[PDB]
Amino acid sequence: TAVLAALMALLIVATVLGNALVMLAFVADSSLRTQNNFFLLNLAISDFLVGAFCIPLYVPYVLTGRWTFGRGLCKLWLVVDYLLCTSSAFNIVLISYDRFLSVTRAVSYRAQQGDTRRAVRKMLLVWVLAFLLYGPAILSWEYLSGGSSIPEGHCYAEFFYNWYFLITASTLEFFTPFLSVTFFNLSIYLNIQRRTRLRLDSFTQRFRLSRDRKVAKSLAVIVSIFGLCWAPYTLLMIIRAACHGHCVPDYWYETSFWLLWANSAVNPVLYPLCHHSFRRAFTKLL
Template identity: 65%
Template structure:
């Protein structure tokens, strides 16, 4: 967003009476300047390309145009403009220490920069809130999926609120106070050292959004844990119930159940038998049952004359057929259950990553900005503040990887853009095969 470059130790003091251009030139050595320029160029390319892919995916794949994906598009637009407009104008400023585009364009750049960074934060909150509704109020959420107008209204509200937070203050601060405190050749907001305003704005820009994102994602995680436990309990209950029904229907199962009941009625006699004899008796009983079934089938087929004709009315499914059907059903339920558990675990991990990266990118800048304003720039080294400042823009480069790539539909759209031939040959491969 902005940076008070006049406090850097390499800048000459205004009291020394040197010209402003001579003061701010030659800020870094040649090697440092080249290295920083290359790193900044890489950041610009990563931010622009990553977010451009997200926007192009909406053009290529119409199936992506759902309500929740519109919020990802809104985030990609703000992050794309950060890489295409804000960072390129800041690079010569940070390398030379001098703003060469005039005061009017400085004010425009500040308005757009604050707007884009703030809208990026608000979009992250909106995405987390949308996922929170999709998990906690699934039925109502699905019913509103086709309501594109509501999604567009939320997107517009994000931009309006982001502008109102800093835009009016950047434009009108010098007119309210009656003077401008920004020297020639520098570009930062008039309220840069106003601790009260920055504390209020930071509460709305970072602290409240961070607590909201943490709350939404924690609620989603707890809801997933609760649903996972319920699914496991239901699955085990159905599995045990199906096993008991199968045991009751099969002859071996009936025999074993009778044996169990007999064991309960006459425990004393059972306990008197040696262990080997009990096992031998159970094996003999199982063999006799099989022999009787084989004999019955032979007698009915060989000695019973013509086999009985089966009609649709007289046919009844056998116990073995029902058993196979139930087993197939249990296998299907098991596969579905494992898929859901795997998906829920991946969602939980992605939620933790989202909250962590958001906090790591925004917390240092926000805290240092408040402390710096309170002590008027004398208690925080400038390189720490500058580093924390660049973390905000790094977050714009990370967001396309963090959000859209978590969705299979986006990965498919990226594959369609980057390697359509492999998508036709291997339609079920993940995105990582596209780069090999």
């Protein structure tokens, strides 16, 4: 029992300070003002609030088994939790789209690099579209469908057992973002391999080929980790809705539920830590 409490506490600790260092390094260094650096900050901000607001508030729900924070506060937690997770997925697509432009439209990317007006405009569109996907749905479901089917002491979305809404929402929540990240990271690999093929057609040639393989492994892990954390819960929500939880074990739902929050702890390891500019800032601060 206490082991589970430590594991949840460990996830809180890793997610909070892990995403805090990215925000601390962004403030400390004024040269980290490229559009890519803003996108990494937005991913850090979205993931920071997951481990500081959502996960700590959800710990009593697991240890006690009942939501003791009231019906009113449950709606706030549901909206914030769905807003941050959706924005985290949309930031990953934004980062992968940014990396796709750099390799393909290199001349235009460098000219527009450092344009903070575009960076903030794209950052706001991530949060706005994240809210419009689930904000109105969570808040206005009870007031438009009649009553609330949620029993007292339990806190989950109104559409938790809906089938038509979940498949439609998941298509715009994980299915489209996963294919966009896959397409973007695949086009980077094709462009790098194609450009190197023309370059070769010695010690220098060996190094470039080795560098391309290192990028290929880097691109594969990014698509894998994002897919690995989000696919189980996204598929289980659709599968469990069809059979209303009869065909899905109860402990399987929780395991996939924490995979999404586990993604908020691996994101600082992947995007900012592997970034060269942020790596130097971390060494400068410590």
